Structure formats: structure tokens, C-alpha cells
């Protein structure tokens, strides 16, 4: 069932109870977890928090914890599968699901007693009616009904996508509880910006949600400040910004940010030998000295920093980059700490997807989660350093793939693969960073090629996972277009291709468009996908 009011029939229920949080390892999940943590700590709710990153891990943790806890909250996981089938719970347990994944599984939708969904009912949802999904001429009519059922269920389950941010949902709950702090609002903003950075949502939906959060920012600012008398410099001040699309440009030199932003790198073809000259054309059009552009931004001359955004916008317009400016937010506190929401997103993501072989992925999750609090600001800066390394490695990998021409058409989709032992393949072994790399690589490819048909294709990308088990991760990306809905069918396509091939596919990740394959299975699996997409 959908929860109609989070306050009464979710929060006031669990407020009297011991709770278990399962949280996915993504930045939106981390922000929603932080908001809910702060609420529970205000109300002395005895919660336990468990990270998870796949179905096997969630099943293991639930089997470990099922006896002691009756109330469970799943953040950014569980909505798009039958939780009762997967977990096999006792009937007295209750699962709250604040998950952005769409479409919601019909069993979770119509299970009234046990599965409760912390999902907005005014999100883009098209759930089929109950009578269409659940129960001689009567036999013929029944078989016709079953044919209708399979057709409508395939139409419902074909495309997966993402709804409103879980962090935004939790901040809505905090606002209804009248316990919303400025830091909670910042976590909500970072949660939305995670979806925008990873291209999980459309630009229109992102603009709408930014319009929602603008009102909350204005309310929080005018809560205790006006234009006549102001707060201490120590206090956090969140400001709406119509800022630049360039990544981490306030902590870098502008040259590095123009080099490693996927947008500008794809436009100017900076992987190519000619791309640096095109970048120099752009910089000379702006009139910025190269010794200033290659200097760190905080050390750049303030005469140049005065109107840099207008300069970059108006040069980008005539160079063909039509949407260089983006609606976003920034947070200021103290004298010297200034971050964009995209900066916090990249830092936390790099901490979580860090390639270091220390401890465990749960350890990297813990470092990422700690970095979202201002008492652990050093972790945030360290995450920014890791983001520098990650973005440089991303551009190196894209340059390698395009120069050696690993990205190759195979009919209805482009195909690419990373070989073992190549530079910085370890950084993209993990599925989430691989999905991000595939998106950036597809943007670079469609900006590079002259073939108008190839600009319309989706991308399938693979990389090694475990040589000892002989497995590869595989991800599927929809076509990269300006007006895409960011819906993709590769979940069901992978499932149906694997079933039609009897392939050894482990479906452990929460996105259905991310899978693990036994490596030798890839040839017949790819052939099946080619025959399927046709």
C-alpha cells in the first residue's frame, strides 16, 4: 500500500518502536538516512542502521535481524521487487519502503497489511488495476484474462526509472513534524542533486524539484535573518545559485574543470589531440589569460571572478553549448567553507565508490556517511580530493576507449568493454561508478561521431568484477539525448535475454539494468540481446 500521510500512519507508529534501517549505498539514500537519523535522535527512537548494496546483502542482513526487529525501513531499495517473496518475513512485521526506484512492483502496491510505501502518490505512477492483475466458455474467458494480464504487466514493467528523491520525501516528513533544520534542508538538496548528477531524472523534473526546494530555502533564510540585521558568520547559509555546470570549479583550476567536465569535454573533444586547441579558442574568446585559467580558482584574480559566470555563458552560447548555466544551491558557513550541491555529491560519491582495498564497502559507506556532517568536514575535503582523482581517471578511460575504438556498434545498441589490467579499470569495477562512466562515455561518443543514426543508439558496457570467479559486471544505458525521459528497458531486456539463453546471471544490484555475468556467457548473452532488441 501507499502511505497517504507520512506523519500519522508512518512516523507516529515507529516513534514508539525499535526500528531497523536498511540503506542503499547511494548519495540520495545517505541523505535520506541522515535526515531520518536526525529525526529519530530528536525523539530518542532506538534505531539500528545497516548498510546494504545488493539483494543478497539485504537478504543476509534481514535473516540476521528478523527475530529482534518488527519494524523495518528500506531506503532506496525494495520497491521494484516482491519483498515478501525475497525476504520471507513473518506476518507481524512491517516494511516501510522509501525507495526512488520505479515502477513499484504490483505485489508491493496491493499488499495492504505488511508492505507500506513511503512514496508520493502524485509521482508519475501508472499502476494497473487490481482486477487486471489478480483473480468451455468460462475457461476461454479465463485464458483471455491471463493473456490480458501478461500483456499489461509487460507494458507496466518494461521501462524502469526514478521518482522523487528519498531525501526530499524525508525532508517533507521533517517539515510536517516541524523539526526541519537547515542541515536537513541541505541534505535534501544534496539528495536531489545526486539524482541530477547521475542523470536519474529529467531536466524538467529537476527544475520542478528545485522550485520546490527554493521555497524551503527562502523560509529557512527568513526564519531568523533579514536584509537589515543578520546571523553570525558561523551559521549555515543556504543560497539558491544559477551557477555553472562545470564540476568542482571552485576547488580546482578552471582549466582542469573545463578539462574534466563531461559536458565541455564531450563538446570540445578534449580526449583528441585537436581538443586542447578548441579549448584555447574558447578561452581566447572569453579573454581569460591562460596563466589565470590554470591557477587555482580561489587564487584567481577577483577582477576575473567578478563576472565569470556571464562570460562563460555568453561564450558557451556562441560556441554551441546552449545550457551551460544550471539552477542549483550552495552552502556557506564560517569564513572559508563554500560548497555547491554538486560538489558535495561528487565528494560523497567518491568517498563511497573509493577504489581503496581497505576494510570493506561498508567501511567506505561509513566514511561517505560521516562526511555529510559538518563535524567531519575533513572527510568532505578528502572526498573532494578523491573526486579529482576519479574524474581524471574517468576522462583517461573515455580517451582510451574512443582512441582505441572499443565502443563499437552491434546493431540496435553500442557495445563497449574494459579489459583486465588496463589503467584504472579497478576504479570502475564497482557497478555504480561503471554506470556513471558509461553515461559520460556515451555522451562523449555521440558528441564525437558524425553518424546521425549512431547518435540515437543506447549503450551496453561491461567491465571485470572477479577474476577468481570469472565474472563481469554489465550495465545498460538509454540513448543520450537532450529530450530523453531517462527511462530504460535494459532491466527486462537483460532478464529476458538471460532466461532465453539459460545464462548464469546474478541479479544482485538494485537497478535492474545492472547485472553480473559469468564471463564466458557473454557471447551468447550479447547475441540474445541483439536478437531481442532486433
Amino acid at each position: 500500500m501507499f502511505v497517504s500521510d507520512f506523519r500519522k500512519e508512518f512516523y507516529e507508529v515507529v516513534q514508539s518502536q525499535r526500528v531497523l534501517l536498511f540503506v542503499a549505498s547511494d548519495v540520495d539514500a545517505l541523505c535520506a538516512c541522515k535526515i531520518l537519523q536526525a529525526l529519530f535522535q530528536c525523539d530518542h527512537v532506538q534505531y539500528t542502521l545497516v548498510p546494504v548494496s545488493g539483494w543478497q546483502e539485504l537478504e543476509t542482513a534481514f535473516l540476521e535481524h528478523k527475530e529482534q526487529f518488527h519494524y523495518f525501513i528500506l531506503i532506496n531499495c525494495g520497491a521494484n521487487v516482491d519483498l515478501l517473496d525475497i525476504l520471507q518475513p513473518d506476518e507481524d512485521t512491517i516494511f516501510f519502503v522509501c525507495d526512488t526506484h520505479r515502477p513499484v512492483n504490483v505485489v508491493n502496491v496491493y499488499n495492504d497489511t505488511q508492505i507500506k510505501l513511503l512514496i508520493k502518490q502524485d509521482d508519475d505512477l501508472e499502476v494497473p488495476a487490481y482486477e487486471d492483475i489478480f483473480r468451455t466458455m468460462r475457461r476461454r474467458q479465463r485464458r483471455e484474462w491471463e493473456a490480458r494480464r501478461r500483456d499489461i504487466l509487460f507494458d507496466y514493467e518494461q521501462y524502469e526509472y526514478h521518482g522523487t528523491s528519498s531525501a526530499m520525501v524525508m525532508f517533507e516528513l521533517a517539515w510536517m513534524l516541524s523539526k526541519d533544520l537547515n542541515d536537513m534542508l541541505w541534505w535534501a538538496i544534496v539528495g536531489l542533486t545526486d539524482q541530477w548528477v547521475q542523470d536519474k531524472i529529467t531536466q524538467m523534473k529537476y527544475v520542478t524539484d528545485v522550485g520546490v526546494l527554493q521555497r524551503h530555502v527562502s523560509r529557512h533564510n527568513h526564519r531568523n535573518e533579514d536584509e537589515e540585521n543578520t546571523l553570525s558568520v558561523d551559521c549555515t547559509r543556504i543560497s539558491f545559485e544559477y551557477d555553472l555546470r562545470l564540476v568542482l570549479y571552485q576547488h580546482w583550476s578552471l582549466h582542469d574543470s573545463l578539462c574534466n567536465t563531461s559536458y565541455t569535454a564531450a563538446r570540445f573533444k578534449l580526449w583528441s589531440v585537436h581538443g586542447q586547441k578548441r579549448l584555447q579558442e574558447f578561452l581566447a574568446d572569453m579573454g581569460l589569460p591562460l596563466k589565470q585559467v590554470k591557477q587555482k580558482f580561489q587564487a584567481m584574480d577577483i577582477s576575473l571572478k567578478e563576472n565569470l559566470r556571464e562570460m562563460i555563458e555568453e561564450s558557451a552560447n556562441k560556441f554551441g553549448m546552449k545550457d551551460m548555466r544550471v539552477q542549483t544551491f550552495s552552502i556557506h558557513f564560517g569564513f572559508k567553507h563554500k560548497f555547491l550541491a554538486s560538489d558535495v555529491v561528487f565528494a560523497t560519491m567518491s568517498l563511497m565508490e573509493s577504489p581503496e582495498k581497505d576494510g570493506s564497502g561498508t567501511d567506505h559507506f561509513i566514511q561517505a556517511l560521516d562526511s555529510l556532517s559538518r563535524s567531519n568536514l575533513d572527510k568532505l575535503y578528502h572526498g573532494l580530493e578523491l573526486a579529482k582523482k576519479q574524474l581524471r581517471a574517468t576522462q583517461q578511460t573515455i580517451a582510451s576507449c574512443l582512441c582505441t575504438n572499443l565502443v563499437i556498434s552491434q546493431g540496435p545498441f553500442l557495445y563497449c568493454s574494459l579489459m583486465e589490467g588496463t589503467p584504472d579499470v579497478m576504479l570502475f569495477s564497482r557497478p555504480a561508478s561503471l554506470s556513471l562512466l558509461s553515461k559520460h562515455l556515451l555522451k562523449s561518443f555521440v558528441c564525437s561521431t558524425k553518424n546521425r543514426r549512431c547518435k540515437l543508439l543506447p549503450l551496453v558496457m561491461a567491465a571485470p568484477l572477479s577474476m577468481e570467479h570469472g565474472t563481469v559486471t554489465v550495465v545498460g544505458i538509454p540513448p543520450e539525448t537532450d529530450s530523453s525521459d531517462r527511462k530504460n528497458f535494459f532491466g527486462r531486456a537483460f532478464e529476458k535475454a538471460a532466461e532465453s539463453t539459460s545464462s548464469r546471471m546474478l541479479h544482485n544490484h538494485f537497478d535492474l539494468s545492472v547485472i553480473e555475468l559469468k564471463a564466458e556467457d557473454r557471447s551468447k548473452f550479447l547475441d540474445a540481446l541483439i536478437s531481442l532488441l532486433s
Binding site: 579558442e281 581566447a284 574568446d285 579573454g287 589569460p289 591562460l290
Partner: protein, 220 residues
């Protein structure tokens, strides 16, 4: 305004002629037009490409080929070896305001651009230099034997008055003698003065010694 002319006929000397306002403006316009209209044998606008390749790298120095300057503008090639300092100053100004037409924000990068002449056909052996070549543009070849370090030389110097706060206005430094104020216009104290080290404009300086290449003519 000052009217355009036939340039090559005059009663003055060449230096005096190109110093006068009318022909100076005509020379300026001619070199501007030459930069903005010269083309390659294949029809490529040469100096648009060269100015773009300069402004990309911020090199603030434009190389011009005599062998096509003579092709496009005859009289400029005529006056250039005869009055090089004056004509090169005029070329610098014209090139600067061409570059600020192509890249209007380039004054943020540099306030002055030097025109450098290449492939000058009146080449001279280094030991064959005579009084006949004085104050004329020459081309020579040789091996560099010595170099000073890169040193700052005064170019536009403002002097603090020896007894009060006043800055005596800019003097254009020469390569022949250290220019001096004599006495201050606000109060006629005289003799020694202090350079305003902050407001004075300096330029890079480097003096090299070149001699004939060992294998060219020095046969013992």
C-alpha cells in the same frame, strides 16, 4: 580628417616623411588593410589564422613575412628598411587595433603587440657591416657566444621629487643614455631624484654577443 595620399613621392627624408601625421595615418591604414586582406596562394586569410594562433597562446607578438608584405603593399616595403623604428612602431599600433578587433578582450592579456619582420632579403655578412648600414634594418647570421641574464630595463620612468611627494611625469627611456628630469615642475628642486619603483614601467632586457660561425669564413 587627414586625407589619404600617394605615399612614395615627397621632398622630406624618409624618417621625417613617415614621422609626419598625414603619411603616418596613411601607413597605419595600409598596414591595417594588409593584415585584414592578405591571403595565401590557396586563398586562406593568413593573418586571421596567425592572430588566432597568437591569441590562443597569448604570445603577444605577430610575425610578418617581408616577401609578401612587398607583394601586397609596395611602399611599406620601400620605407621599412629605410626608417625601421618609425614604421615598426606604426605597424605595432595597427596590429594592436586589428587584434583588438578580432579579440576585443585581448587588452586584458596585453596592452602592446610587437610586429616581428622575417625573411628580410637584404641579408649581410657579419664582418661586412659598414657605416652604409647605420640606422637601417639588416639581417645577419652568427653563433651566440654570450648572453646576459634577463634584466628589467626602465621604459617609462616616473621620478619622486628629491624633497617632496610629487611624481615627475613619464620619461621614455632610451638605449643611449639614462633620461633624467632636471628639475621638478611643482617646485624647481633639481639634481638627484628617486625612481618610483612601483609606478615605473619596466621591460625585459637581454644583451647577447654574436660572432661569425666557425665554419663560415674563419679559416684560421
Amino acid at each position: 580628417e587627414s586625407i589619404e595620399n600617394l605615399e612614395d613621392l615627397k621632398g622630406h627624408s624618409v624618417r621625417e616623411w613617415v614621422s609626419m601625421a598625414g603619411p603616418r595615418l596613411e601607413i597605419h591604414h595600409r598596414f591595417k588593410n594588409f593584415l585584414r586582406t592578405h591571403v595565401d596562394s590557396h586563398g586562406h586569410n593568413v593573418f586571421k589564422e596567425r592572430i588566432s594562433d597568437m591569441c590562443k597562446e597569448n604570445r603577444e607578438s605577430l610575425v610578418v613575412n617581408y616577401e609578401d608584405l612587398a607583394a601586397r603593399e609596395h611602399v611599406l616595403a620601400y620605407f621599412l628598411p629605410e626608417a625601421p623604428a618609425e614604421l615598426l612602431q606604426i605597424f605595432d599600433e595597427a596590429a594592436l587595433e586589428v587584434v583588438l578587433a578580432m579579440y576585443p578582450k585581448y587588452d586584458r592579456i596585453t596592452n602592446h603587440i610587437h610586429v616581428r619582420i622575417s625573411h628580410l632579403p637584404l641579408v649581410e655578412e657579419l664582418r661586412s657591416l659598414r657605416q652604409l648600414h647605420l640606422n637601417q634594418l639588416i639581417r645577419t647570421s652568427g653563433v651566440v657566444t654570450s648572453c646576459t641574464g634577463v634584466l628589467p630595463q626602465l621604459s617609462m620612468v616616473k621620478y619622486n621629487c628629491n624633497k617632496c611627494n610629487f611624481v615627475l611625469g613619464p620619461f621614455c627611456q632610451s638605449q643611449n643614455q639614462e633620461v633624467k628630469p632636471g628639475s621638478c615642475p611643482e617646485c624647481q628642486s633639481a639634481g638627484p631624484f628617486e625612481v618610483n619603483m612601483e609606478e615605473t614601467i619596466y621591460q625585459n632586457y637581454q644583451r647577447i654577443r654574436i660572432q661569425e660561425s666557425p665554419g663560415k669564413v674563419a679559416a684560421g
